[PDB]
Amino acid sequence: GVQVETISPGDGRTFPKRGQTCVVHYTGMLEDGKKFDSSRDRNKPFKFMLGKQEVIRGWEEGVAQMSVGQRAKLTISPDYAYGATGHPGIIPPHATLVFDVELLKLE
């Protein structure tokens, strides 16, 4: 499902680990409509843990697949997003999600 279209590679060796938190800044836009998932978190971008599925696959996968200081435009598919039952307005069914994520650091 998910694809990783990096823009800025990161160091290339430092990625999240099982037990670390990821600190990411992202833009979640839809194929051709708008932003639904954006992290314009005043003073604290989004964070989550790897192996606890607190995000969709596209992310656990996608972001795990990114290194510290790497930014990518990930394209996620139903299978890796909110499959079919999305939330009618934010994520209608079978909508592809696009996430311009920047892995800031691990916590």
PDB file of N, CA, C and O in Angstrom, residues 47-85:
ATOM      1  N   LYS A  47       3.857  12.603  17.626  1.00  0.00           N
ATOM      2  CA  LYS A  47       4.826  11.563  18.046  1.00  0.00           C
ATOM      3  C   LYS A  47       4.043  10.286  18.252  1.00  0.00           C
ATOM      4  O   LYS A  47       2.864  10.358  18.535  1.00  0.00           O
ATOM      5  N   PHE A  48       4.699   9.178  18.112  1.00  0.00           N
ATOM      6  CA  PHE A  48       4.016   7.866  18.311  1.00  0.00           C
ATOM      7  C   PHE A  48       5.121   6.850  18.563  1.00  0.00           C
ATOM      8  O   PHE A  48       6.282   7.229  18.528  1.00  0.00           O
ATOM      9  N   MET A  49       4.773   5.622  18.803  1.00  0.00           N
ATOM     10  CA  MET A  49       5.776   4.554  19.066  1.00  0.00           C
ATOM     11  C   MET A  49       5.647   3.491  17.984  1.00  0.00           C
ATOM     12  O   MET A  49       4.586   3.285  17.424  1.00  0.00           O
ATOM     13  N   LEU A  50       6.741   2.840  17.729  1.00  0.00           N
ATOM     14  CA  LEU A  50       6.799   1.772  16.706  1.00  0.00           C
ATOM     15  C   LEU A  50       6.492   0.435  17.359  1.00  0.00           C
ATOM     16  O   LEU A  50       7.151   0.068  18.314  1.00  0.00           O
ATOM     17  N   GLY A  51       5.521  -0.260  16.849  1.00  0.00           N
ATOM     18  CA  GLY A  51       5.158  -1.585  17.421  1.00  0.00           C
ATOM     19  C   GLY A  51       3.927  -1.469  18.291  1.00  0.00           C
ATOM     20  O   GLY A  51       3.557  -2.431  18.930  1.00  0.00           O
ATOM     21  N   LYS A  52       3.314  -0.317  18.306  1.00  0.00           N
ATOM     22  CA  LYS A  52       2.096  -0.133  19.147  1.00  0.00           C
ATOM     23  C   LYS A  52       0.936   0.288  18.238  1.00  0.00           C
ATOM     24  O   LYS A  52      -0.134   0.598  18.721  1.00  0.00           O
ATOM     25  N   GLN A  53       1.177   0.277  16.957  1.00  0.00           N
ATOM     26  CA  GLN A  53       0.148   0.662  15.945  1.00  0.00           C
ATOM     27  C   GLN A  53      -0.720   1.851  16.400  1.00  0.00           C
ATOM     28  O   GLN A  53      -1.932   1.775  16.425  1.00  0.00           O
ATOM     29  N   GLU A  54      -0.079   2.932  16.746  1.00  0.00           N
ATOM     30  CA  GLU A  54      -0.860   4.133  17.196  1.00  0.00           C
ATOM     31  C   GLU A  54      -1.173   4.985  15.961  1.00  0.00           C
ATOM     32  O   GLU A  54      -1.868   5.980  16.031  1.00  0.00           O
ATOM     33  N   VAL A  55      -0.633   4.575  14.852  1.00  0.00           N
ATOM     34  CA  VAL A  55      -0.846   5.303  13.579  1.00  0.00           C
ATOM     35  C   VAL A  55      -1.299   4.253  12.570  1.00  0.00           C
ATOM     36  O   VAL A  55      -1.419   3.091  12.904  1.00  0.00           O
ATOM     37  N   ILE A  56      -1.531   4.664  11.361  1.00  0.00           N
ATOM     38  CA  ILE A  56      -1.973   3.662  10.361  1.00  0.00           C
ATOM     39  C   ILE A  56      -0.709   2.958   9.873  1.00  0.00           C
ATOM     40  O   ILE A  56       0.393   3.428  10.110  1.00  0.00           O
ATOM     41  N   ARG A  57      -0.907   1.864   9.188  1.00  0.00           N
ATOM     42  CA  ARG A  57       0.250   1.088   8.675  1.00  0.00           C
ATOM     43  C   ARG A  57       1.148   2.029   7.905  1.00  0.00           C
ATOM     44  O   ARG A  57       2.298   2.171   8.249  1.00  0.00           O
ATOM     45  N   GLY A  58       0.607   2.628   6.883  1.00  0.00           N
ATOM     46  CA  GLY A  58       1.363   3.593   6.033  1.00  0.00           C
ATOM     47  C   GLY A  58       2.385   4.379   6.837  1.00  0.00           C
ATOM     48  O   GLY A  58       3.454   4.674   6.349  1.00  0.00           O
ATOM     49  N   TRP A  59       2.032   4.691   8.051  1.00  0.00           N
ATOM     50  CA  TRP A  59       2.947   5.461   8.928  1.00  0.00           C
ATOM     51  C   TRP A  59       3.910   4.583   9.682  1.00  0.00           C
ATOM     52  O   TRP A  59       5.102   4.785   9.593  1.00  0.00           O
ATOM     53  N   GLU A  60       3.388   3.638  10.411  1.00  0.00           N
ATOM     54  CA  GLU A  60       4.298   2.753  11.189  1.00  0.00           C
ATOM     55  C   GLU A  60       5.370   2.256  10.222  1.00  0.00           C
ATOM     56  O   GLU A  60       6.545   2.259  10.518  1.00  0.00           O
ATOM     57  N   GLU A  61       4.902   1.865   9.084  1.00  0.00           N
ATOM     58  CA  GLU A  61       5.750   1.352   8.003  1.00  0.00           C
ATOM     59  C   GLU A  61       6.589   2.503   7.438  1.00  0.00           C
ATOM     60  O   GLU A  61       7.793   2.609   7.569  1.00  0.00           O
ATOM     61  N   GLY A  62       5.856   3.377   6.819  1.00  0.00           N
ATOM     62  CA  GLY A  62       6.434   4.575   6.162  1.00  0.00           C
ATOM     63  C   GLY A  62       7.496   5.278   6.969  1.00  0.00           C
ATOM     64  O   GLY A  62       8.633   5.398   6.570  1.00  0.00           O
ATOM     65  N   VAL A  63       7.079   5.721   8.108  1.00  0.00           N
ATOM     66  CA  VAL A  63       7.990   6.440   9.016  1.00  0.00           C
ATOM     67  C   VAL A  63       9.111   5.511   9.497  1.00  0.00           C
ATOM     68  O   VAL A  63      10.238   5.950   9.625  1.00  0.00           O
ATOM     69  N   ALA A  64       8.806   4.271   9.767  1.00  0.00           N
ATOM     70  CA  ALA A  64       9.899   3.358  10.234  1.00  0.00           C
ATOM     71  C   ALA A  64      10.932   3.259   9.127  1.00  0.00           C
ATOM     72  O   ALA A  64      12.109   3.064   9.358  1.00  0.00           O
ATOM     73  N   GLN A  65      10.421   3.404   7.947  1.00  0.00           N
ATOM     74  CA  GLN A  65      11.212   3.337   6.722  1.00  0.00           C
ATOM     75  C   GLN A  65      11.884   4.687   6.416  1.00  0.00           C
ATOM     76  O   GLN A  65      12.417   4.865   5.335  1.00  0.00           O
ATOM     77  N   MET A  66      11.852   5.612   7.344  1.00  0.00           N
ATOM     78  CA  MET A  66      12.507   6.945   7.100  1.00  0.00           C
ATOM     79  C   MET A  66      13.574   7.128   8.176  1.00  0.00           C
ATOM     80  O   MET A  66      13.451   6.564   9.250  1.00  0.00           O
ATOM     81  N   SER A  67      14.583   7.904   7.892  1.00  0.00           N
ATOM     82  CA  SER A  67      15.647   8.116   8.903  1.00  0.00           C
ATOM     83  C   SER A  67      15.538   9.512   9.506  1.00  0.00           C
ATOM     84  O   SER A  67      14.868  10.396   9.003  1.00  0.00           O
ATOM     85  N   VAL A  68      16.221   9.642  10.599  1.00  0.00           N
ATOM     86  CA  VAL A  68      16.298  10.880  11.385  1.00  0.00           C
ATOM     87  C   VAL A  68      16.761  12.020  10.469  1.00  0.00           C
ATOM     88  O   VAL A  68      17.891  12.019  10.010  1.00  0.00           O
ATOM     89  N   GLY A  69      15.881  12.945  10.219  1.00  0.00           N
ATOM     90  CA  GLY A  69      16.247  14.090   9.347  1.00  0.00           C
ATOM     91  C   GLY A  69      15.833  13.800   7.920  1.00  0.00           C
ATOM     92  O   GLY A  69      16.262  14.498   7.024  1.00  0.00           O
ATOM     93  N   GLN A  70      15.018  12.799   7.722  1.00  0.00           N
ATOM     94  CA  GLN A  70      14.590  12.479   6.332  1.00  0.00           C
ATOM     95  C   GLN A  70      13.159  12.954   6.185  1.00  0.00           C
ATOM     96  O   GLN A  70      12.368  12.875   7.111  1.00  0.00           O
ATOM     97  N   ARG A  71      12.866  13.431   5.011  1.00  0.00           N
ATOM     98  CA  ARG A  71      11.506  13.928   4.712  1.00  0.00           C
ATOM     99  C   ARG A  71      11.116  13.233   3.446  1.00  0.00           C
ATOM    100  O   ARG A  71      11.918  13.079   2.537  1.00  0.00           O
ATOM    101  N   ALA A  72       9.887  12.858   3.443  1.00  0.00           N
ATOM    102  CA  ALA A  72       9.319  12.146   2.280  1.00  0.00           C
ATOM    103  C   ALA A  72       7.870  12.514   2.159  1.00  0.00           C
ATOM    104  O   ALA A  72       7.268  13.063   3.059  1.00  0.00           O
ATOM    105  N   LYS A  73       7.381  12.164   1.017  1.00  0.00           N
ATOM    106  CA  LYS A  73       5.978  12.399   0.649  1.00  0.00           C
ATOM    107  C   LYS A  73       5.650  10.929   0.530  1.00  0.00           C
ATOM    108  O   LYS A  73       6.147  10.269  -0.364  1.00  0.00           O
ATOM    109  N   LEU A  74       4.848  10.463   1.426  1.00  0.00           N
ATOM    110  CA  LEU A  74       4.457   9.035   1.413  1.00  0.00           C
ATOM    111  C   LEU A  74       3.068   9.048   0.811  1.00  0.00           C
ATOM    112  O   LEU A  74       2.325   9.990   1.015  1.00  0.00           O
ATOM    113  N   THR A  75       2.755   8.020   0.104  1.00  0.00           N
ATOM    114  CA  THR A  75       1.423   7.918  -0.532  1.00  0.00           C
ATOM    115  C   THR A  75       0.957   6.656   0.189  1.00  0.00           C
ATOM    116  O   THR A  75       1.705   5.694   0.234  1.00  0.00           O
ATOM    117  N   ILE A  76      -0.223   6.679   0.741  1.00  0.00           N
ATOM    118  CA  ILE A  76      -0.759   5.502   1.469  1.00  0.00           C
ATOM    119  C   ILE A  76      -2.022   5.111   0.729  1.00  0.00           C
ATOM    120  O   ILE A  76      -2.683   5.941   0.136  1.00  0.00           O
ATOM    121  N   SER A  77      -2.314   3.859   0.818  1.00  0.00           N
ATOM    122  CA  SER A  77      -3.503   3.270   0.162  1.00  0.00           C
ATOM    123  C   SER A  77      -4.459   2.766   1.255  1.00  0.00           C
ATOM    124  O   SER A  77      -4.033   2.646   2.390  1.00  0.00           O
ATOM    125  N   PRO A  78      -5.698   2.478   0.924  1.00  0.00           N
ATOM    126  CA  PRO A  78      -6.684   1.913   1.886  1.00  0.00           C
ATOM    127  C   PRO A  78      -6.062   0.839   2.781  1.00  0.00           C
ATOM    128  O   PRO A  78      -6.117   0.918   3.992  1.00  0.00           O
ATOM    129  N   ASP A  79      -5.490  -0.125   2.123  1.00  0.00           N
ATOM    130  CA  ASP A  79      -4.824  -1.281   2.787  1.00  0.00           C
ATOM    131  C   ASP A  79      -3.848  -0.841   3.854  1.00  0.00           C
ATOM    132  O   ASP A  79      -3.620  -1.555   4.813  1.00  0.00           O
ATOM    133  N   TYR A  80      -3.278   0.315   3.675  1.00  0.00           N
ATOM    134  CA  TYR A  80      -2.305   0.830   4.667  1.00  0.00           C
ATOM    135  C   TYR A  80      -2.842   2.060   5.388  1.00  0.00           C
ATOM    136  O   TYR A  80      -2.114   2.634   6.180  1.00  0.00           O
ATOM    137  N   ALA A  81      -4.054   2.441   5.116  1.00  0.00           N
ATOM    138  CA  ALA A  81      -4.643   3.640   5.785  1.00  0.00           C
ATOM    139  C   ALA A  81      -5.836   3.229   6.637  1.00  0.00           C
ATOM    140  O   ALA A  81      -5.687   2.493   7.590  1.00  0.00           O
ATOM    141  N   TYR A  82      -6.992   3.700   6.270  1.00  0.00           N
ATOM    142  CA  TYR A  82      -8.229   3.376   7.023  1.00  0.00           C
ATOM    143  C   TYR A  82      -9.065   2.545   6.047  1.00  0.00           C
ATOM    144  O   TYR A  82     -10.174   2.892   5.704  1.00  0.00           O
ATOM    145  N   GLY A  83      -8.472   1.460   5.635  1.00  0.00           N
ATOM    146  CA  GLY A  83      -9.083   0.486   4.675  1.00  0.00           C
ATOM    147  C   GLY A  83     -10.315   0.948   3.889  1.00  0.00           C
ATOM    148  O   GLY A  83     -10.174   1.517   2.824  1.00  0.00           O
ATOM    149  N   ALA A  84     -11.481   0.706   4.419  1.00  0.00           N
ATOM    150  CA  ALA A  84     -12.736   1.114   3.714  1.00  0.00           C
ATOM    151  C   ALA A  84     -13.606   1.980   4.605  1.00  0.00           C
ATOM    152  O   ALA A  84     -14.233   2.920   4.157  1.00  0.00           O
ATOM    153  N   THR A  85     -13.619   1.626   5.848  1.00  0.00           N
ATOM    154  CA  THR A  85     -14.427   2.365   6.837  1.00  0.00           C
ATOM    155  C   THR A  85     -13.556   3.495   7.408  1.00  0.00           C
ATOM    156  O   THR A  85     -12.810   3.329   8.354  1.00  0.00           O
TER     157      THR A  85
END
